[PDB]
Design a protein around this ligand. Structure first.
Ligand code: HEM
Length: 464
């Protein structure tokens, strides 16, 4: 009949003195060693229940999926979202908007053919862009992010952005800037002291201008769609949401208004871009550090696909090792370590612990991906974690970078496709060369907070 144990919290500051804001994951894992896998931390005034290891996260988010179905809080993001949009909402907003969004993604591709060809075409444009560097030593960041973003930008804006559009570069800078901030010390300090810091000068204010610029843009692209709309023929996601908005103009109790559109669209545009981009950027660094994996990936491509035709999604089933590399890239990468905070919808009983209504939950996706029970060498990049003795692909229940449950990533279909069609096509046409010897390439993250971000590196893409 008691809430999980945890260190003694001082008023307002919580467990600030017992935690390091630069390495929140390490700080929570140190406390897991004393108080067990399910403990209570006070991030300032924010009472949070932290779940560590697979069993804890799965038991809570899957077995008791309905009880842990509520959405928590991410203070930097909730500065511009304020509970609006598909991602940061609860109840009838999170049920209506999650329903509409998954639907409106299938009717414009996602998981089908309409998006597979659209990703293949875009993959062919990344090939051009990298062949256009003439094998010069470059920063892959914006080359990869440009490609990735255009896939989701097709669904939400109608068409793709052109690689030279300076507003596009500016929007991608905004997306990288916030994923950088929320992963820094000041970003994680902001999760504790948002109520004060929101009004104080600093790095939090610059990050806000990045979110405002992103919101300003979506509102601009929505207004255009309004005065140029075809009510019987929707061009994109904004257009389909604009149809429903009118079919609800008579319902005062609707969740389909202008504010929820600007937000749902923004949330997707960022959530589709920066997540898959970070995974790609970390991926190529992991491959340069390990030539042996690149070589076997190359062997599988030469054998299965060839040097001619552009790889297609269905080739994945005839390609076991490749799927295992992408899986280990996502695992080691740990793109979003502490998920996107959950909240218990009603008073719960979880393993002899009481969690009152409204209690924020932190599912540590990283501790599940780095679980020593489900993985042989959780600290190393070794695709064999997802590969049995006969070289076949082996699944794992601890593989959760997309999370699990009732509020999981409904962009998993698009994300896994993008990663297969971008990694493979680049690996077929190009061989990777670093700037330094593989024994020196640092694979440890530069920042770990909301997101896990790799180090700033440079490389060259040489043809085959
Ligand atoms: C490698 C890529 C990706 C990773 C690691 C990832 C990660 C996550 C995670 C950890 C969550 C929270 C799940 C939870 O409730 O516990 C989430 C939410 C979500 N993701 Fe992704 N994601 C990825 C790609 C995508 C893509 C491609 C899209 C866009 C189509 C997207 C759409 C969203 C949305 C809209 C949510 C909120 C769902 C809800 O509140 O019901 N994600 N993502």
């Amino acid at each position: 009949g008691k809430l999980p144990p945890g260190p003694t919290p001082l008023p307002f500051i919580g467990n600030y003195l017992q935690l390091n804001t630069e390495q929140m994951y390490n700080s929570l894992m140190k406390i897991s060693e004393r108080y067990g896998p399910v403990f209570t931390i006070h991030l300032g005034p924010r009472r949070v229940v932290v779940l560590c290891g697979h069993d804890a996260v799965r038991e809570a988010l899957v077995d008791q999926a309905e009880e842990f179905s509520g959405r928590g809080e991410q203070a930097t993001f909730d500065w511009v979202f304020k509970g609006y949009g598909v991602v940061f909402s609860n109840g009838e907003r999170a049920k209506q908007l999650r329903r509409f969004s998954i639907a409106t993604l299938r009717d414009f591709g996602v998981g089908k053919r309409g998006i597979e060809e659209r990703i293949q075409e875009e993959a062919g444009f990344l090939i051009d862009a990298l062949r256009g560097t003439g094998g010069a030593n470059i920063d892959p960041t914006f080359f990869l992010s440009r490609t990735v973003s255009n896939v989701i930008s097709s669904i939400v804006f109608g068409d793709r952005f052109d690689y030279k559009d300076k507003e596009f570069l500016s929007l991608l800078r905004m997306m990288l800037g916030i994923f950088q901030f929320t992963s820094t010390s000041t970003g994680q300090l902001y999760e504790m002291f948002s109520s004060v810091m929101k009004h104080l000068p600093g790095p939090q204010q610059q990050a806000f201008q990045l979110l405002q610029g992103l919101e300003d843009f979506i509102a601009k692209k929505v207004e255009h769609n309004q005065r140029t709309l075809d009510p019987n023929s929707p061009r994109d996601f904004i257009d389909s949401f604009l149809i429903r908005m009118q079919e609800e103009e008579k319902n005062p109790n609707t969740e389909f208004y202008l504010k929820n559109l600007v937000m749902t669209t923004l949330q997707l545009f960022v959530g589709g871009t920066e997540t898959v981009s970070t995974t790609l950027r970390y991926g190529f660094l992991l491959l340069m550090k390990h030539p042996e994996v690149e070589a076997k990936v190359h062997e599988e491509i030469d054998r299965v696909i060839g040097k001619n035709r552009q790889p297609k999604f269905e080739d994945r089933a005839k390609m076991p090792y490749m799927e295992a590399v992408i899986h280990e890239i996502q695992r080691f990468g740990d793109v979003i370590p502490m998920s996107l905070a959950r909240r218990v919808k009603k008073d719960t009983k979880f393993r002899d612990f009481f969690l009152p209504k409204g209690t924020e939950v932190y599912p540590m996706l990283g501790s599940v991906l780095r679980d020593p029970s489900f993985f042989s060498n959780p600290q190393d990049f070794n695709p064999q974690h997802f590969l049995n003795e006969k070289g076949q692909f082996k699944k794992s229940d601890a593989f959760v970078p997309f999370s699990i449950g009732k509020r999981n990533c409904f962009g998993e279909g698009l994300a896994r496709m993008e990663l297969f069609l971008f990694f493979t096509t680049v690996m077929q046409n190009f061989r990777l060369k670093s700037s330094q010897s593989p024994k020196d390439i640092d694979v440890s993250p530069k920042h770990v907070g909301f997101a896990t971000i790799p180090r700033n590196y440079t490389m060259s893409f040489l043809p085959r």
